[PDB]
């Protein structure tokens, strides 16, 4: 695997340093090492609408992955994002899709009563992939690339080197 940064930049009113208790590191709150949880700078303020693009220039396709947030109650989405409707539009020269956060009650898993679900796609060389998000997006900050061929073993026996 090889990793290439995306270079995304966000405005003054977007806080890309969201953290949660259920993903710990060094005894402090943390998040996934390659995904950025955008939220409003100040609770209650409508999330500004923004558009982002990834500009591929390498010679081989890269595997881009992202996720979306599904709050737990109306009291949450009104705080993290705002009161207007949320919607996310994705688009490349080959991949199109549309999503929307939806809120509902759920059983508690770990210390969080919400959910985040991940998608992925392949970005061909010389192409552009666009993220037009108004709220609820969990944007990436690095995109991996897969190189070579190998073998995958699925077992639990001790390793031997001789």
């Amino acid at each position: 695997i090889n990793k290439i940064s995306t270079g995304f930049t966000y405005g003054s009113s977007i806080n890309s340093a969201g953290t949660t208790r259920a993903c710990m590191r060094n005894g402090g709150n943390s998040f996934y090492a390659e995904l950025k949880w955008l939220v409003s700078k100040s609770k209650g303020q409508n999330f500004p609408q923004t558009t982002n693009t990834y500009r591929n220039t390498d010679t081989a396709e890269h595997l881009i992955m992202w996720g979306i947030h599904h709050p737990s109650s109306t009291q949450e989405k009104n705080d993290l994002y705002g009161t207007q409707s949320l919607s996310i539009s994705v688009g490349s020269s080959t991949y199109r899709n549309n999503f929307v956060p939806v809120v509902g009650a759920r059983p508690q898993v770990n210390g969080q009563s919400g959910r985040i679900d991940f998608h992925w796609t392949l970005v061909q060389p010389g192409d552009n992939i666009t993220f037009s998000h108004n709220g609820g997006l969990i944007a990436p900050s690095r995109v991996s690339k897969l190189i070579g061929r190998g073998l995958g073993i699925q077992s639990d026996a001790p390793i031997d080197n001789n």
Binding site: L151, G152, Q154, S155
Partner: protein
């Protein structure tokens, strides 16, 4: 004529029922050919060895 083989199903996760059955059907139907083919193939080598060695005498 060695050819490397990969894994087509997960040993710790689960597989969909619709496709899991098709994978299961093919494997059991392919194991039934090697088992039948090996039994008879060896029996035709034991048979010839006995006849061959008795002609040399």
């Amino acid at each position: 004529t060695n050819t490397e083989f990969e894994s087509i199903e997960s040993e710790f996760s689960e597989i969909e029922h619709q496709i899991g059955n098709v994978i299961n059907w093919t494997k059991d139907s392919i194991t039934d050919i090697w088992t039948y083919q090996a039994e008879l193939l060896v029996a035709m080598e034991n048979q010839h060895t006995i006849d061959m060695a008795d002609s040399e005498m």
